[PDB]
């Protein structure tokens, strides 16, 4: 945001699972499109933890 170091941190952090922050995001929720979680953190949710839209598919991403 406010500096190149903060901008760098944001782009590094945005790759990581929003729940555990320990593993890259590896799932996109259909239909809402949120890139939220690694594969393990996506196992327990049936609604998106950001927008609460019912998940119809947990699509693997790379």
Q: Catalog residues that contact its own copies under the rule CB under 8 A.
A: 4-5, 7-8, 11-12, 15, 28, 30-35, 50-51, 57, 59-62
Looking at 32, 35, 45, 58, which residue binds Zn ion (CB under 5 A)? 32
Choice between 5 and 46, CB closer to its own copies: 5
**Cα distance between residue 37 and residue 42, in whole Å:** 6
- Is residue 26 near Zn ion by the rule CB under 5 A? no
Contact 55, 48 (CB under 8 A): yes
Rounded to 5°, the CA angle 3-18-15 comes to 55
């Amino acid at each position: 945001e406010i500096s190149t170091e903060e901008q760098l941190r944001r782009l590094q952090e945005e790759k990581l699972c929003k729940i555990c922050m320990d593993r890259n995001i590896a799932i996109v929720f259909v239909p809402c499109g949120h890139l939220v979680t690694c594969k393990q953190c996506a196992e327990a949710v049936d609604k998106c933890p950001m927008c609460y839209t019912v998940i119809t598919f947990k699509q693997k991403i790379f």
